[PDB]
Ligand binder design. Structure first.
Ligand SMILES: [K+]
Length: 217
């Protein structure tokens, strides 16, 4: 009595969460699952081992995969691991326009703040920029000012965001045959932008994911 309705509500909640991020970025695959504790909702895409790109806002109360090296070929189902309910979105499927029941996109701060502070955050970012040949000039120009918190010019913030948008489009158009090289650049640029916006925990999130994305064998 009422068991079907409760089970249905649980599955429908996961699908609304998936469709909420999918309609923001439908060109990549997504999945969400409920852990056996009954309270942890895990959200993944296979773009880069569990990293969530910055232009996607997250529903409330979702949990992300922690930054660890994961195999390139794992699909969204494999990335969820052990769960008791699953919903997914295949890349390039059409997603309906949102209605009143769409989940509120308030979950970015909590979801992306679960990573401990990277050791020597500032020097680590500057070293990463130094050793990356593929970065645009704006990254070399304001990496150290962003770490020193001296402030940058508006045209420099505009150029940085223009380069973030460009690598986003380069990567998502090459998906699923994208180069993790370009994804790493996307992550480093995203860390710089969060830094100049005083969102240091976001810069930490992107820097931590950069390290596992660019790790050697
Ligand atoms: K959760």
């Amino acid at each position: 009595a009422g068991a079907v309705s409760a089970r249905a509500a649980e599955q429908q909640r996961l699908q609304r969460i998936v469709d909420a991020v999918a309609r923001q970025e439908p060109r990549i695959s997504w999945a969400a699952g409920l852990r056996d504790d009954g309270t942890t909702t895990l959200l993944v895409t296979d773009l880069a081992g569990g990293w969530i790109p910055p232009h996607v806002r997250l529903p409330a109360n979702v949990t992300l995969l922690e930054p660890t090296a994961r195999r390139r070929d794992a699909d969204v189902i494999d990335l969820l691991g052990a769960v008791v309910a699953v919903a997914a979105h295949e890349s390039n499927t059409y997603v309906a326009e949102p209605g009143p029941d769409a989940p509120a996109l308030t979950g970015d701060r909590s979801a992306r703040s679960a990573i401990p502070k990277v050791d020597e955050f500032g020097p680590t970012l500057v070293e990463a920029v130094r050793r990356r040949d593929s970065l645009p000039r704006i990254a070399q120009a304001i990496a150290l000012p962003a770490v020193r918190k001296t402030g940058v010019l508006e045209n420099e913030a505009e150029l940085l965001h223009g380069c973030i948008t460009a690598v986003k489009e380069s990567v998502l158009k090459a998906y699923p045959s994208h180069e993790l090289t370009a994804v790493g650049d996307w992550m480093l640029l995203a860390a710089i932008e969060a830094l100049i916006d005083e969102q240091d925990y976001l810069a930490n999130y992107h820097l931590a994911w950069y390290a596992v994305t660019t790790r050697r064998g």
